[PDB]
Design a protein around this ligand. Structure first.
Ligand SMILES: CN1CCN(c2ccc(-c3ncnc4ccc(-c5ccnc(N)c5)cc34)cc2F)CC1
Length: 339
């Protein structure tokens, strides 16, 4: 495999201490994903640490990463001071037949953060700082000349800049696309998949906002909001909480009959054991009146009934079935949850 350097999976086999192009000293493996690996390395030229994303030596992942490159460079045109919470790509090169993207060094992802809470959540206060940043970032993505849909937002793809501050950035634009290129279908990570994509419908940048809604709940409860084991399980879990989608959407939806049928009165309903539509209330998931998630924030400052109600209202606005009315970054930042 690649002269001895690659494993079965088409990944580069790392050796600590290795020096690349008399420039980068590879310190260690940070983590793996589908696209391959990220290693910690020292750049002797710029005299800083970098995270190097090493793409699998395979056409599918390579082509995907070149898309990521194009988009990242595009974003870096607009954001010259790194203000808009998108990881910075410094440069890229080929090396032992693997594309390598060189990023600024960040810290843990919000999933790993959640795992150190034992999946019991972080504070609403911290949830709010994540929210504010994330909404700002979605606002940047929606600048006309970018019009970028991340398409794979989840806690895994959101990293702290460092372990002590609440600053974050979004990573991983490998599944990303600009508005209008609608050739992809069955996109997003299932748990965070928007109704429009589930239903096979045209989609736009609002699908990220759906993802974000899911994420912010999960950041406070510690738990995925809508943990489907497949698309049917997923649409059903959404319907538990938010009820049957509006009829004017299902009428237009190619995949409507993957989850719904019509009753004799001509109205849409499910096919198939779950709680009845809209009875799994976000009011109880968040524990607005009941001390927060699992009652664990009873008495704790910043977790009042009032505060939970603001938060609930923001979320329901992000989880609007209708992509037209779903809250948009700008007005999400104007929400009373952030006053
Ligand atoms: C299960 N594993 C756990 C750890 N994983 C992981 C965590 C953090 C990073 C990472 N750390 C620091 N700086 C980074 C800079 C950029 C990127 C990155 C990742 C993917 N796409 C882009 N565009 C940027 C990651 C880090 C890396 C990790 F692999 C993975 C999951």
């Amino acid at each position: 495999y690649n002269d001895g350097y690659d494993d079965d999976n088409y990944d580069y086999i790392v050796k600590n201490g290795e020096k690349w192009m008399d420039r980068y000293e590879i310190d260690s493996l940070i983590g793996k994903g589908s696209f391959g690996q990220v290693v910690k390395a020292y750049d002797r030229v710029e005299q800083e640490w970098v995270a190097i994303k090493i793409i699998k030596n395979k056409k599918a992942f390579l082509n995907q990463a070149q898309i990521e490159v194009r988009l990242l460079e595009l974003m870096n045109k607009h954001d010259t001071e790194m203000k808009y919470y998108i990881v910075h790509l410094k440069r890229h090169f080929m090396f032992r037949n693997h594309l390598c993207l060189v990023f600024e060094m960040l810290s843990y992802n919000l999933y790993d953060l959640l795992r150190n809470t034992n999946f019991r959540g972080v504070s609403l206060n911290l949830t709010r700082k994540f929210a504010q940043q994330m909404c700002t970032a979605l606002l940047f993505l929606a600048t006309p000349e970018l019009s970028i849909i991340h398409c794979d937002l989840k806690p895994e793809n959101i990293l702290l800049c460092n372990p002590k501050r609440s600053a974050i950035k979004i990573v991983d634009f490998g599944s990303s696309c600009q508005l209008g290129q609608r050739i992809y279908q069955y996109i997003q990570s299932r748990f965070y998949r928007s109704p429009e994509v589930l239903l096979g419908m045209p989609y736009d940048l609002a699908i990220d906002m759906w993802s974000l809604g899911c994420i912010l709940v999960e950041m406070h409860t510690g738990e995925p909001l809508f943990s489907g084991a497949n698309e049917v399980d997923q649409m059903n879990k959404i319907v538990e909480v938010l009820g049957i989608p509006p009829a004017h959407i299902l009428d237009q939806a190619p995949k409507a009959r993957k989850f719904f049928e019509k009753l004799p009165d001509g109205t849409w309903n499910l096919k198939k054991e779950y709680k009845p539509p809209g009875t799994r209330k976000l009011h109880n998931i968040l524990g607005v009146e009941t001390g927060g998630p699992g009652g664990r924030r009873a008495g704790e400052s910043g977790h009042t009934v009032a505060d939970y109600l603001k938060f609930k209202d923001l979320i329901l606005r992000m989880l609007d079935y209708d992509p037209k009315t779903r809250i948009q970054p700008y007005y999400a930042l104007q929400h009373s949850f952030f006053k």
